[model samples]
Target: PLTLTAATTRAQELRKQLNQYSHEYYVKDQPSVEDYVYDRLYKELVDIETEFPDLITPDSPTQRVGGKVLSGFEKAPHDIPMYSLNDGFSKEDIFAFDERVRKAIGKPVAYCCELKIDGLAISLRYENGVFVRGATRGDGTVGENITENLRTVRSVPMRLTEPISVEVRGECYMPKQSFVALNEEREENGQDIFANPRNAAAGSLRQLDTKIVAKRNLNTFLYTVADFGPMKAKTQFEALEELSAIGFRTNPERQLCQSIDEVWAYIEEYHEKRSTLPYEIDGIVIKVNEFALQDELGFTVKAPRWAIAYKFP
Candidate 1:
């Protein structure tokens, strides 16, 4: 049996080494060590942490999926409300959105089309560019706080490359491959399979135990900066660019379209190509590019008038 002191010392050493390796693999997409080497270090850390649980911290690699089941989920209100997007399943619906934008802004609008990720909506808060808090999209007005579980996502920066306070919105999703594997494991273990990737992601994120969420192998792409202190972008496209600069993952498949036709072309191209990727995306979210125009168009009681969800049939 490992003594507490030995476990703590070994866990600390392994964490530092793993963090370095993770930075290489996640941030740079260049691996410094073999996958087996990293796995062994990770297993050692987990073993030590399990032996001495008190050494765990919020930023600990082991605490990424969350820990401790709550008696019940508590409500958390958003400082800025998260609005839903109006859906357009067909070209006619897309034309209606264009017509509305033309009427509201009285000018032809440029659009930024992004993938509509099939996952849970999460708000990530960074204080001085360091990841601090994360929450679920509960009723748009409130959500469940899950900061610890979010820390496990390697693509999410533990600390930003630069110091800036920002509250960003992103989708926390289970990759299709991971989702498939999870279902396989569950089925082998005689558990029910999740209906889809979105269901799997939502179920994984809601776990009170961070370890469970961590085991689910979730990924994220932050495409919107809901609020940033002293930082602003001119358009939705620019917002994504800023997020990328801050070391947040954004989908590289976005398109800036001059017209609805261009949006249609991009949507068509991706509809066939989406399955080839490692992740699952349900559809495309199209938004007016300009912030002023978006603000002018404002929102209904529920969704933004300036944006629409172009769903694949």
Candidate 2:
């Protein structure tokens, strides 16, 4: 048997290597070490932790899979409360939105139109650029803490490109391929098949066992990051740019529409082409570009007046 100090040193070394290996394979999608090698190191670390008992740290890679099955979800609070968007189904309603924005600003306003991802809305909190917490959009104000599951998402960077604190909001989705396969596996195992991709995505994220969440092949596309940290983007378009720069995935199809007609064009463009998309979009979300302008157009009690969702039939 090794001395306690020696075992602790070896355990710490093993942990650092395993965490880096996991970050490379899971977050960066660049596996440097082979699976067998990683598993061996992980086993060694686990054995040491079991022996020492007091040496196991919270940030250990083994802890990422979750220690126990949770009885229920815990409530999480959002400092900058998440708000819902008002819906605009018809072209005239969207035209009215254009008119309202033009009336509010007294000039032509730019809008950012993005595909409204049909999945669970999640918030990721990062402290000094390291992802610390994540939650669901339960009622916009209070959400269920699902940090463990969110950590399993491959695209969620364990550390950001820049070391700054921020809370980013985005959609957590199950790719159609992943969703189909999950449902097929369930069916093969005499379990119920998920009705749709959105449901499957939501169900997958709600799992208390993060290992299951990790295996779900979940993906994310981070969108907003205003007033979060050092980043100061004045417009929605710039927010998208900053998110991409800070090592978060933003939808490539996001476009800045200079005119209301351009917004209409974007709507028509994506609506017809969505059949080719890997994930589902229920509609297009249109938001006033300028942050100051959004504040001017401001919020109603229920939803954001500066933004509208053009929901599909």
Candidate 3:
């Protein structure tokens, strides 16, 4: 046992190290410390904080276990609405999109192609790199607060590597493995089974008791920085890279396609290979690479003209 002053300093040091280790392991896919070393340090901090509860911080690793249950979720309004994507079912739609974009921009454009993960779309707000709020995309304009539930997700960074205030958008998904096991257990318990992984993830997040959410093993892949704050990225690819640098999980399979033909090739390739992926993907998303081009192309009433989702048949 140590004095309160010594315990405070040690606890702070452990948090900084733990947060860094977690970022490297989860977000960057590289960890500097060994697993046992991390566990040892974590246990030390947990012990210290347990003895001196007042020294604990909300961003502390232990706090990720979750909080007290709530009777219901509070409604949160999205300052910038979360737009749904326009669906493209055929090669004609893709080419038409490309044609319209070229005609509007009057120049050849590159594209950012990514897998459209089948999951719930959610928004996360961070202040000074510390995660502050999380909400469901209830109706794009409004959502229900799910911050406590989101906190349980290991991949969702409790604090960012950089102290930038930003709002990010991404999918909250349950992995195929987790979804299967969850259903099996639910069936054994004589409870209802989820229709699919997306619904399972949605149901897990809807739990009022965040402890239940923690057990569900939810994961996230953050993509857009809805509120960029001081950050700047000229292209969508650069923005994704920047998001990764700031301690957010991003899908690793994103590609920069030079033309619509390349986009089609990507879609075809992923369509055939989708089943091999760990997470479920319903389609492919194509976005104009340059922010300038996207700004000029602008948006329709609901979806963006610069982006489209190619749904698989």
Candidate 4:
């Protein structure tokens, strides 16, 4: 029989190992260990946790879903308002945006182009590296708290790689396959089908039942860290890299554009290949890569002056 102290030590080691292995396989798409090895370790952790219930921790790999069901979502106020991007419909609009950047900064500026996912904007808060709260973008000021539902998203890490307080912004989306599967299941039950993946993803996240939300298979791609976070990257690309290193799922299809022409090339390339992607992306987001340059450009009334979304027609 394993002693409580011995079990506690083993549990900590198992949690750390499992978390790293899961990150590699799920987020990074590189598995260092065999499937059986992971399964055995996971089983060991589960067994130990069952025996010593008091030793359970919030950041444990096994605690992705909570047992309690919430009656209603609460209000989660934003420390820094989540800003929306201005839309650029045509080449002229993009060129005009580039001109504005040139006039304001009066220097060479590199742009970071990313896929603008067709999904709901979500804000996640981590206190001392543990995920504490998740909310919708609701008016950019206050949002409905969906912490339990968000915890069900496998991509949203319960614990970061380091112990630090931070807030991140991302798109929580349903893959096209998941959307199709969900709709089919709903249809079989004689329930109304969702019109699109975005609608389906939104509906799934709105469920008060954590168990139901966990079954939805929703995924996320965190793009930006809120101003309230301790970890700040010098550039937009670096921010993506940092978020990925910190155990957050970030989109890997980002490109660094040296100029508006390069940005347009990227847009054109993705537009043609958009339909082939597993998830929906309605546009491309172009942001001034350097954080210092972004500060210089600043924000307009609501949208950021340094970034624009090029919507695909």
Q: Please report, in order, the local distance difference test score of every candidate based on alpha carbons.
A: 0.82, 0.85, 0.91, 0.89
TM-score order of candidates, top first: 3, 4, 1, 2
Q: Write the per-residue lDDT of candidate 2 for residues 130-231, one digit (tens) a residue.
A: 788889988988999988787767677766667889899999998888888999999999998999999998998788877788788888887886246888
Clashing residue pairs in candidate 3, if any?
none
**TM-score, prediction 1:** 0.85
lDDT of 2: 0.85
- Write down the TM-score for model 3: 0.97
Off by over 4 Å in 3: none
Better of 3 and 4 by TM-score: 3
Q: Please say which candidate is ahead in lDDT: 2 or 3.
A: 3
Task: State which candidate has the highest lDDT.
Answer: 3
| Residue 207, model 1, lDDT | 76
Better of 1 and 3 by lDDT: 3
lDDT for residue 39 in candidate 4, whole number 0-100: 91
Ranking by lDDT: 3, 4, 2, 1
Candidate 2 weakest ten by summed lDDT: 59-68
Model 1 scores a C-alpha lDDT of 0.82
What clash pairs does model 1 have?
65-210, 65-214, 66-209, 66-210, 67-210
* Candidate that would win on TM-score: 3
